[PDB]
């Protein structure tokens, strides 16, 4: 019955398109080699003779949550088993994404201080800082009457500010979502605000 040289095998790599068709690791027992489980969307290939595990597809932190766990067999017909942990580091490869490019119209009454508009949320598929999102208003607020809370994405008129329909009747605000990855990724959406008469 064949003896695996290591009790478990392990490697740590950055996810990304540079991983396609690279040799990750070679397992050895003392004889033919297979991956029998943990091979997510056929990411991996084993050389049946040489025992080298190659990435057929891009290593992806978002599919693996940072670790692929492969069950490998060695057979001559007696069989023995091990595990191959392919540990993956997260890179900033997902843009913070709003589900719609435009939402509107959101009604707001003139003549009242600090009314709420609505909450916007961009999703980021990355983890850690790479997945954390900061919100801002980057256009369409020429008098500085609005704020979006930078973590919670709540758009409101500033506390001690009242709108006035005759001054400005409609706003189209560009909202920016920026992640805390290096380099950072961002996207924008458009918010349509209609200002209502105090009747």
Helices (H) and strands (E) in the chain, counts: 1, 14
Under the binding rule (CB under 5 A), the answer on residue 94 touching Ca ion is: yes
Instruction: Mark the segment that binds Ca ion (CB under 5 A) among 7-15, 35-43, 78-86, 100-108.
Output: 7-15
The full 3-state SS of 79-101, as one line of letters, equals: EEEEEEEEEEECCCCCCCECCCC
Under the binding rule (CB under 5 A), the answer on residue 130 touching Ca ion is: yes
- DSSP letters, 11-27, are EEEE-BGGGTT-EEEE-
Strand order across the beta sheet in which 44-46 lies: 23-26, 52-55, 44-46
Instruction: Mark the segment that binds Ca ion (CB under 5 A) among 1-9, 70-78, 88-96, 190-198.
Output: 88-96
Q: Nearer to Ca ion by C-beta: 174 or 187?
A: 187
How far apart are CB 9 and Ca ion at their closest, in Å? 23
Q: Could you give the residue ranges of the DSSP H alpha helices within the chain?
A: 61-64
Under the binding rule (CB under 5 A), the answer on residue 103 touching Ca ion is: no
One of 4, 9, 33, 61 touching Ca ion (CB under 5 A): 61
Nearest to 56 by CA among 73, 77, 35: 35
What are the structure tokens assigned to 7, written together? 């009790």
Pick out residues in 179-198 that bind Ca ion (CB under 5 A): 179, 181
Under the binding rule (CB under 5 A), the answer on residue 90 touching Ca ion is: yes
Under the binding rule (CB under 5 A), the answer on residue 162 touching Ca ion is: no
Under the binding rule (CB under 5 A), the answer on residue 59 touching Ca ion is: no
SS3 186: strand
Contacting positions for Ca ion (CB under 5 A): 15, 60-62, 90, 92-94, 124, 126, 130, 179, 181
């Amino acid at each position: 019955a064949p003896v695996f040289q290591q009790p478990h095998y392990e490697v740590v790599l950055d996810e990304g398109p540079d991983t396609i068709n690279t040799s990750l690791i070679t397992v050895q027992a003392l004889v033919t080699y297979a991956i029998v489980a943990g091979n997510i969307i056929n990411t991996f290939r084993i050389n049946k003779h040489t025992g080298v595990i190659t990435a057929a597809k891009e290593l992806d932190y978002e599919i693996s949550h940072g670790r692929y766990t492969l069950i490998v067999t060695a057979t001559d017909r007696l069989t023995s088993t091990t595990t191959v942990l392919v540990n993956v580091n997260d890179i900033n490869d997902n843009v913070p994404t709003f589900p719609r490019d435009y939402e509107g119209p959101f009604d707001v009454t003139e003549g009242q201080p600090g009314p709420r508009v609505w909450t916007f949320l961009a999703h980021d598929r990355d983890s850690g800082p790479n997945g954390q999102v900061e919100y801002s208003v980057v256009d369409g607020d020429p008098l500085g009457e609005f704020v979006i809370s930078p973590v919670e994405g709540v758009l409101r008129v500033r506390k001690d500010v009242e709108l006035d329909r005759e001054t400005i009747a409609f706003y189209n605000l560009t909202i920016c979502a920026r992640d805390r990855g290096v380099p950072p990724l961002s996207s924008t959406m458009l918010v349509g605000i209609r200002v209502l008469d105090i009747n």
